[PDB]
Amino acid sequence: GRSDAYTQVDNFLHAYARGGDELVNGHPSYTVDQAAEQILREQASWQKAPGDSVLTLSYSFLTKPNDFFNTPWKYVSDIYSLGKFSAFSAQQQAQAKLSLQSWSDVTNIHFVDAGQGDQGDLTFGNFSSSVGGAAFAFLPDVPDALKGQSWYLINSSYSANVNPANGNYGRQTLTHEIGHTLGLSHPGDYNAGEGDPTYADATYAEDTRAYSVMSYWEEQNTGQDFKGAYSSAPLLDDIAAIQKLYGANLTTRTGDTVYGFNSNTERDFYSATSSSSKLVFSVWDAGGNDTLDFSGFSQNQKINLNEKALSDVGGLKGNVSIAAGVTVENAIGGSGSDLLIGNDVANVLKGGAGNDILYGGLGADQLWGGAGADTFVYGDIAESSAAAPDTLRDFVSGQDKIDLSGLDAFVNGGLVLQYVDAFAGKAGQAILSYDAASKAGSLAIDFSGDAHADFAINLIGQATQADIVV
Ligand SMILES: [Ca+2]
Ligand SMILES: [Ca+2]
Ligand SMILES: [Ca+2]
Ligand SMILES: [Ca+2]
Ligand SMILES: [Ca+2]
Ligand SMILES: [Ca+2]
Ligand SMILES: [Ca+2]
Ligand SMILES: [Ca+2]
Numbered sequence: 001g002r003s004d005a006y007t008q009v010d011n012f013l014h015a016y017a018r019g020g021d022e023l024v025n026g027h028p029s030y031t032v033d034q035a036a037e038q039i040l041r042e043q044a045s046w047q048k049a050p051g052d053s054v055l056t057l058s059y060s061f062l063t064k065p066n067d068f069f070n071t072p073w074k075y076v077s078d079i080y081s082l083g084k085f086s087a088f089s090a091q092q093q094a095q096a097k098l099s100l101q102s103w104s105d106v107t108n109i110h111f112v113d114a115g116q117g118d119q120g121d122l123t124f125g126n127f128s129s130s131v132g133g134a135a136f137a138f139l140p141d142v143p144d145a146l147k148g149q150s151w152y153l154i155n156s157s158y159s160a161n162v163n164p165a166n167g168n169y170g171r172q173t174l175t176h177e178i179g180h181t182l183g184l185s186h187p188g189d190y191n192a193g194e195g196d197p198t199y200a201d202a203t204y205a206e207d208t209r210a211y212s213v214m215s216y217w218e219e220q221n222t223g224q225d226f227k228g229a230y231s232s233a234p235l236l237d238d239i240a241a242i243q244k245l246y247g248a249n250l251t252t253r254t255g256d257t258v259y260g261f262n263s264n265t266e267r268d269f270y271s272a273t274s275s276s277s278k279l280v281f282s283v284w285d286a287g288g289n290d291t292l293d294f295s296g297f298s299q300n301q302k303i304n305l306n307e308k309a310l311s312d313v314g315g316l317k318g319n320v321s322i323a324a325g326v327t328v329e330n331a332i333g334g335s336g337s338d339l340l341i342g343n344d345v346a347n348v349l350k351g352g353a354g355n356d357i358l359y360g361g362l363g364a365d366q367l368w369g370g371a372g373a374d375t376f377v378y379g380d381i382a383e384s385s386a387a388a389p390d391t392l393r394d395f396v397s398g399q400d401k402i403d404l405s406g407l408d409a410f411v412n413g414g415l416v417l418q419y420v421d422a423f424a425g426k427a428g429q430a431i432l433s434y435d436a437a438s439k440a441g442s443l444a445i446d447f448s449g450d451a452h453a454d455f456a457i458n459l460i461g462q463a464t465q466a467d468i469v470v
């Protein structure tokens, strides 16, 4: 009968489900693509210049008011005044460049620094009198006089935009408004709308800050919890949306990249500096052997390397995701009791201290449970074919367990394992080998009864029959 260990894997594999025919939060559930289509509903976009291979947009920081500032009412009907104008401070400029970069990392856009003034295709400036919210931008389908502008509220009472920094609202607002200048709309409001909306007014359930920085709804609405932090860079649905517009950037991080601790992506939102770090990011990577290093956290974590899946990293829930079309290969857990689930390719999963549950999935994985009593789960024989078997690089009999309880053959077929020394031609025969010389163990099982192993598991440590769970 299925074990608790296998149950935890199955549960997390289906956590944060999207696209179900069901009504989630009284709203239809959209897939990543349906969501992208919704975010792009206005059909606004920049046109790539003649002879340019990539869309090239320059940006500049306004030094004095422009036409729209002086005469807002000539463009936006109900804006009589914007208060006092002020230029972007040094911090706002540095942070604005990091947000711009986070967009160019995922699409084919090359941002050029036009400096101080009104010469850039995208301009940034501050205003002091709110017209409703804390900032605003114009999509690229407006007359040339307005195209590319984004404005941010700064005054004695509202200070969120004064010091943008990794993880805070000020930084997300920059990323959000720039999104607008690039062509992205809020995930909702167009068919109708009002003055005081709530998440109840969302078009689809995944319109929350866990899937799109363009949303205004808390991630809690969908089950995630970033504990006060805000994503500084584009999230799962934003990447998909911006990519339909300007294509996927296939030149980004093509080397062997590490995300989290010991990061080599010179990006603040992909790096963890201490155990107290609150990470919130969606991985976009175009190539190489990559690792999600979450070694520094002591909390119980759940990591899923499948694309489009979210993980509960460092104390937060559903804070780490992997974009569509991305293959991350390895993951390293921390000292807490973790759940690491791999994807279709060969993965290196390291549970570290604590009692972990490792699920390699398809491909020949290298599973390391590390200190503690770890469980290595399997739910399909093809996950460790005899042709391309897994390798348990640090098995410890009487401590670690190999979990086979969720296989169909056992849970439905009622197959019983008979430990033989040679395949005779009966289904259910298993040979537990072990060369004391190399200290290399082995487990082969013939499910089809044709005297040939269908499922195999290499080992480096001793595996007794009392270690295998069915
Ligand atoms: Ca890479
Ligand atoms: Ca990769
Ligand atoms: Ca661990
Ligand atoms: Ca795998
Ligand atoms: Ca462990
Ligand atoms: Ca162990
Ligand atoms: Ca496998
Ligand atoms: Ca066979």
Ligand SMILES: [Zn+2]
Residues within 6 Å of the ligand: 176, 177, 180, 186, 214
């Ligand atoms: Zn907005």
